[PDB]
Amino acid sequence: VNNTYRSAQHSQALLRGLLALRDSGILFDVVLVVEGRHIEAHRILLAASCDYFRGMFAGGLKEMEQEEVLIHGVSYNAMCQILHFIYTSELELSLSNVQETLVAACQLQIPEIIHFCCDFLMSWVDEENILDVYRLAELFDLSRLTEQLDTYILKNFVAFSRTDKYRQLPLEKVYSLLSSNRLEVSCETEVYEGALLYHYSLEQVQSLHEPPKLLETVRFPLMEAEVLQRLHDKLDPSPLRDTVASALMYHRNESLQPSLQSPQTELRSDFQCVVGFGGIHSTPSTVLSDQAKYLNPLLGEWKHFTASLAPRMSNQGIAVLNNFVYLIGGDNNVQGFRAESRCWRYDPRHNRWFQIQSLQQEHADLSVCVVGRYIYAVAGRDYHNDLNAVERYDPATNSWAYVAPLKREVYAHAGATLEGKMYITCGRRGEDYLKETHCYDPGSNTWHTLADGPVRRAWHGMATLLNKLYVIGGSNNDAGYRRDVHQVACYSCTSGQWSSVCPLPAGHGEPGIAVLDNRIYVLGGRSHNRGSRTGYVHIYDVEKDCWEEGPQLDNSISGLAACVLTLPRSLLLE
């Protein structure tokens, strides 16, 4: 209790001394007189906040070496306002003096006070003072006022469309703002109405003869199919007609929609709230869940979502391509060994669903990584046993493309392509437990040597987090007994070294990779020591290097996987 600390009450003592000196009419070093009115404040705090004011007050003239200080060749009102704002830490503005006060604060290099005043003015801006906001922002050129004005425009464009403010606003700026995928919109009809109001008189709307350039900013494929068809029915021959035809073709060819992507088919919404799909939860019975109810660590609470057309599959392989989550196969050995062939792919970005037919693949409980237009499948099993003959397939073309066969038979194992190279580690060839790890690169179409796991575990899948094999621990009876692995370490096979990563609090093989807010979150699996599924998950980031309590899942489940995707504002609206 004798460590040297840092003084923090010196400023309070200095302010108290300055106030005592000022109240007694002594130690008058800085004096400001405005129209015969005297204002008392502590000059110590004011002179210690910025350097421009200190240099102006004490440049070295005769004013700084006398009881009375005179400022010649300067503006008395601006200097007095700046000094008052710096000393009293308050922004006293009016309906017409807001711009002058903001300019005075900016001249004093006060970011916090100026930003607070600008935010207060924006939040208390009347309709009759609309012209007093844009002009003030243009004249002041504040680093924060422009952003506040842009946010207000983006949030009140709907209200401005009805009023004449939309007409007064620049057309080029409005078009540029609409082009960016950040504006808050509800329906394509509203966007079209806003574009028409920007490109035509508001009174006229309440002229489609001339196709404006800003009309192309509206995403035709993102509109409703019926609405798009109705618009194209009366659409005259023009670039808008071509866009409508392209959108109609994309809608009618939804089977190959991912292969017919266009620059105008981009979404614009959220991106977090990872929503889990599938999986088998022991509580209250072994059934394939079809609801979207997860626990997003970023939000700090359980994720809320509505699963529409969610397939009833457990531990299904999840592959994300073109920002779309696809589920292929999926063993259901929890309720009994039975191979699953039917598979479906969802397209939340396109607001539709696709029934991707799957070919006859002799694999179960296998993970397929879609790298580019081709995919590779590893692990797998025969009809009643495991096998080492791994055959890949391409979901894009439903073709059984040839891939590198597995080095050893894998039972309930997984394999993912790290930096475009499939990796297989641990595993168990039936009763025998495999330990050698082979990283068969899909590009080379052959097996290759890879670094063995730091801990001699079995039935552990291979996952690629941050371009590294972030898998450690594992808990299964294939190691010899139901004994927990007391040694946990992260050995990067790609780098051939024990790269530093976040240690796993619990060891579980075949963990589902889930990245949210740059945090390596792994859940699911079963603990041999506990003799059941693990319902505890921790969301910790090695990069953050912060230890805290991760969100708890709603129920204990196994074989749950998730991926990063853009979520709509409807989920956050509830």
Q: Distance between CA atoms of 289 and 283, rounded to whole angstroms?
A: 11
Q: Which is nearer to a second copy, 22 or 413 (CB)?
A: 22
Q: Which is nearer to a second copy, 13 or 227 (CB)?
A: 13
520 touches 476 (CB < 8 A): no
Counted residue by residue, the chain has a size of 574
Taking CA atoms, 354 is separated from 184, 249, 367, 556, 567, in Å, by: 28, 16, 20, 30, 19
Q: Which is nearer to a second copy, 21 or 320 (CB)?
A: 21
Taking CA atoms, 160 is separated from 163, 172, 202, 256, 361, in Å, by: 5, 16, 11, 40, 57
Minimum separation from the CB atom of position 37 to a second copy (A): 19
Number of CB atoms found within 10 A of residue 475's CB: 24
Q: Which is nearer to a second copy, 116 or 353 (CB)?
A: 116
Q: Which is nearer to a second copy, 52 or 337 (CB)?
A: 52
465 touches 520 (CB < 8 A): yes
Q: Which is nearer to a second copy, 17 or 372 (CB)?
A: 17
Measuring CA to CA, which residue among 186, 190, 231 is closest to residue 211? 231
Q: Which is nearer to a second copy, 6 or 338 (CB)?
A: 6
Minimum separation from the CB atom of position 183 to a second copy (A): 21
Minimum separation from the CB atom of position 458 to a second copy (A): 40
Q: Which is nearer to a second copy, 123 or 360 (CB)?
A: 123
- DSSP tag of 521: E
Minimum separation from the CB atom of position 573 to a second copy (A): 20
Minimum separation from the CB atom of position 23 to a second copy (A): 8
Minimum separation from the CB atom of position 419 to a second copy (A): 42
Minimum separation from the CB atom of position 21 to a second copy (A): 6
End-to-end CA distance of the chain: 51
Q: Which is nearer to a second copy, 115 or 421 (CB)?
A: 115
Q: Which residue has the tokens 């421009």?
A: 52
171 touches 195 (CB < 8 A): no
Number of CB atoms found within 10 A of residue 185's CB: 18
Radius of gyration of the chain (CA): 33
Q: Distance between CA atoms of 204 and 217, rounded to whole angstroms?
A: 21
- Tokens of residue 170, six digits: 């620049």
Q: Which is nearer to a second copy, 8 or 74 (CB)?
A: 8
User: Phi and psi of 427, rounded to 5°?
Assistant: 90, 170
Minimum separation from the CB atom of position 182 to a second copy (A): 24
Q: Which is nearer to a second copy, 20 or 389 (CB)?
A: 20
- Tokens of residue 364, six digits: 């179960």
Distance of CA 199 to the CA centre of its chain: 33
- DSSP tag of 515: E
Rounded to whole angstroms, the maximal C-alpha distance in the chain is 100
15 touches 45 (CB < 8 A): yes
> Residues in the site for a second copy, rule: CB under 8 A?
1-8, 10-11, 13-15, 17-18, 20-21, 24, 26-29, 43-45, 47-49, 51, 54, 58-60, 64-65, 88-92, 112, 116, 120, 123-124
Minimum separation from the CB atom of position 34 to a second copy (A): 19
Minimum separation from the CB atom of position 6 to a second copy (A): 7
- Exposed / middle / buried, residue 192 (Cβ in 10 Å: 0-12, 13-18, 19+): middle
Minimum separation from the CB atom of position 76 to a second copy (A): 21
Residue 328 pairs in a beta bridge with 317
